[PDB]
Amino acid sequence: DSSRRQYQEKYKQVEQYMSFHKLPADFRQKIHDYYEHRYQGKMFDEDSILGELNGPLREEIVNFNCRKLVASMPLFANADPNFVTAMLTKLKFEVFQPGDYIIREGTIGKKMYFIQHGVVSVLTKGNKEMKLSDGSYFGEICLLTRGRRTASVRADTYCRLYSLSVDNFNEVLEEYPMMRRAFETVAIDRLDRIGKKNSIL
Amino acid sequence: DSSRRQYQEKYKQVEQYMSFHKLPADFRQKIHDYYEHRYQGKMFDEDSILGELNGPLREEIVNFNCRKLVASMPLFANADPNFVTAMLTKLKFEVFQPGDYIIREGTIGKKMYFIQHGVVSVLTKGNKEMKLSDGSYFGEICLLTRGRRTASVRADTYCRLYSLSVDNFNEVLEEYPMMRRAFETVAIDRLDRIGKKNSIL
Amino acid sequence: DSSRRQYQEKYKQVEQYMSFHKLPADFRQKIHDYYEHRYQGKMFDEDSILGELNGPLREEIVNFNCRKLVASMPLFANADPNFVTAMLTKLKFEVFQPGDYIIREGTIGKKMYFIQHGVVSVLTKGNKEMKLSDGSYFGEICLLTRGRRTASVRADTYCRLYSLSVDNFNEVLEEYPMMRRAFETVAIDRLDRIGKKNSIL
Amino acid sequence: DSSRRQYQEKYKQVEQYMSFHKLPADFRQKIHDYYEHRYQGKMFDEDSILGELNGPLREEIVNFNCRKLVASMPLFANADPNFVTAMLTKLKFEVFQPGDYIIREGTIGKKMYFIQHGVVSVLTKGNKEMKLSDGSYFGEICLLTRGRRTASVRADTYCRLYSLSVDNFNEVLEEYPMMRRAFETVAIDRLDRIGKKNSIL
Numbered sequence A, B, C, D: 001d002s003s004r005r006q007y008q009e010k011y012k013q014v015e016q017y018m019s020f021h022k023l024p025a026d027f028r029q030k031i032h033d034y035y036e037h038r039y040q041g042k043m044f045d046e047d048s049i050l051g052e053l054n055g056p057l058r059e060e061i062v063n064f065n066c067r068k069l070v071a072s073m074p075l076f077a078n079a080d081p082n083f084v085t086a087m088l089t090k091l092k093f094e095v096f097q098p099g100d101y102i103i104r105e106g107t108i109g110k111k112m113y114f115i116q117h118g119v120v121s122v123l124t125k126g127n128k129e130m131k132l133s134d135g136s137y138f139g140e141i142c143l144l145t146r147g148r149r150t151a152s153v154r155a156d157t158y159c160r161l162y163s164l165s166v167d168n169f170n171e172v173l174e175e176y177p178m179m180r181r182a183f184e185t186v187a188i189d190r191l192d193r194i195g196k197k198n199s200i201l
């Protein structure tokens, strides 16, 4: 309805922006496709909508929208549902396109990512490429060590990801501190295969 | 007028949101009813309205809207009206529905609640259920001990509540510090019946 | 133009708010008059307008709008115009109505006030009433001592005031620290007449 | 399209603002010209547009819009493109008019400036005037010493500048710390000609 119109009017706004800045045709179409995969023809002022509600209704909503994500990921599926709800209410949906570098190996990490749908490639100068996909997560190491990205991560397909910031990642682990051990265990496993080890875990 | 229209257009926005995320029929009606109890057919950009005013007019307004809350609650009714005004200007109105868990026993507390209208149930694994209702308040213990919720609290009816955040709760007790003793006294009483005691009070 | 319409539509929004909360007739008219003295039939999204500009244009604008305030107040009139400009760009315009208590004697101070037009009464339990008016300022003591209001201040007429917050008051005195001595001198004078003295000045 | 209309309606809003505050004719035209050089007939809610996108698309966009700035400025042109991208995503576009004092010699520095197009004059009481122009930058010293502006800087022509705040300047140099040495080297050179020296560099 008026969400279909909001999508349209917002995209025309994007169209005049690229017109104004004279971006090439291929870049414009790339932005067109992002816009279609990410919003799918409707646009919602989601912060304002859920802010009209209360905690229980918001929590009931995120749990419904993410049933598949929760169900297919053992970390969430077997955890205390209150831990899950706390994580879910802070996830932010993001779409990446084939070839995008989601994470660069040198940099500082400010967020981790949960793969709802898609394939990514884990890359280090000096090892092979492992694939991660639906039900998996990545970017957690830098969050735990407070260090620097131990690899680059690259979208292979269109990716529908849910991201979690370092602050919210930590606010949720102060609460429910048993769950940090669950993250470190897999992080230790993954480091041991990329020829790495680290005392901090 | 245009507040009746704002209610309508905002709710249709909510309607397309649940349509987009394919929520079941019972959940949609539950959200419909919340929306009717909480906004009652009109929607006001209340932050912007009261921000157009000045301190005295804002203070005169909250005191008028809350005469009954103040009058039926001894803590406010017999306190220094400036203490009351300071508390009132930071309360945030909230509606909960039957069955909602307002507070879960394990968690960290970030706010307390004043009952304008409604009945709630106080619940601990290992004690009976006490009811609280109009003129009463709850969630104050965690605010004082800076600890962890000593019980769960559950809406029995539709509840019209006014919430107060930990920060504002503390900003108002630094000012007017005699009023903290008033909170602790009742908190000590309530702990002594749920078989509990605590040195911090 | 569309600022006259914005005034109208915004006020009708206020009208439905008081209708919804059933405020009495005298309080509604009091709010009507405030709205007319404060906005004078036009409403401007002033943060957004001046944010479209740059520093020099903003500084040239506040200096023009406040020529009279600056010219009739020795503190500003003889100060370094850069000090003045720094103060001016942080002033916030406020209107008070006869009888309003602008400052209550017990409380914590978070701002001071510069009188563009109007008369106020300085009040302490145990002294006479001094009047301040156009070209004068007040609320500065608590800002300097970081203490507690040494008196109440009460609008006698409609007052057009410019307020300055404690933070901005301090950001401007770290810069230009010679000007704090100018404030303390008058504050020491005013304390000595209300039978008071204070070491911190 | 609707960006051309947004320019128009926004400018009429500015027009009623100056009408309301009765600004003289020359000042109004000065604001008219600023508005034309700065927005060029179109207005975009740029924060919201780029916020609809993702990191890679935003980074690809700033890099395209600033190809000339990057290419003509050795500091950026020969640096690690990730350093550049980090700087670019935090630049804020600004237009200054002939005669404006961009930086005053006494003051505290909160930002530096990169000259996309324009000529400025570097001024100290007690030295000659050096000109800087396209491809050059200034305001970096105060950012490095955390001190006080070592000179005034004055627009000679219309200037199209990109500014960088002290915080973002520092967030980017914690990352990529080799680039601070590049700034200090030129800062040391520039100080040595204005008869100055400083241990902190």
Ligand SMILES: Nc1ccn([C@@H]2O[C@@H]3COP(=O)(O)O[C@H]3[C@H]2O)c(=O)n1
Residues within 6 Å of the ligand: A103, A109, A122, A130, A132, A137, A138, A139, A140, A141, A142, A143, A148, A149, A150, A151, A152, A153, A189, A190, A191, A193, A194
């Ligand atoms: N054998 C490995 C090693 C690392 N990784 C992920 O790559 C991420 C890159 O950034 P990070 O924040 O260091 O966390 C890393 C792992 O999730 C992985 O998925 N498999």
Ligand SMILES: Nc1ccn([C@@H]2O[C@@H]3COP(=O)(O)O[C@H]3[C@H]2O)c(=O)n1
Residues within 6 Å of the ligand: B103, B109, B122, B130, B132, B137, B138, B139, B140, B141, B142, B143, B148, B149, B150, B151, B152, B153, B189, B190, B191, B193, B194
């Ligand atoms: N006998 C008792 C014990 C506790 N309570 C309230 O339950 C709240 C649960 O969270 P809280 O923040 O620990 O504060 C508690 C009391 O208000 C109560 O109302 N009666």
Ligand SMILES: Nc1ccn([C@@H]2O[C@@H]3COP(=O)(O)O[C@H]3[C@H]2O)c(=O)n1
Residues within 6 Å of the ligand: C103, C109, C122, C130, C132, C137, C138, C139, C140, C141, C142, C143, C148, C149, C150, C151, C152, C153, C189, C190, C191, C193, C194
């Ligand atoms: N003789 C006096 C004493 C005090 N005052 C002002 O009253 C203000 C009340 O709050 P304040 O922040 O303590 O600063 C005080 C003086 O400006 C005044 O105007 N004349």
Ligand SMILES: Nc1ccn([C@@H]2O[C@@H]3COP(=O)(O)O[C@H]3[C@H]2O)c(=O)n1
Residues within 6 Å of the ligand: D103, D109, D122, D130, D132, D137, D138, D139, D140, D141, D142, D143, D148, D149, D150, D151, D152, D153, D189, D190, D191, D193, D194
């Ligand atoms: N010989 C010099 C000396 C100083 N400058 C610039 O002037 C700026 C004024 O503020 P700043 O922040 O101290 O940084 C200074 C230099 O960029 C310059 O461009 N050439």
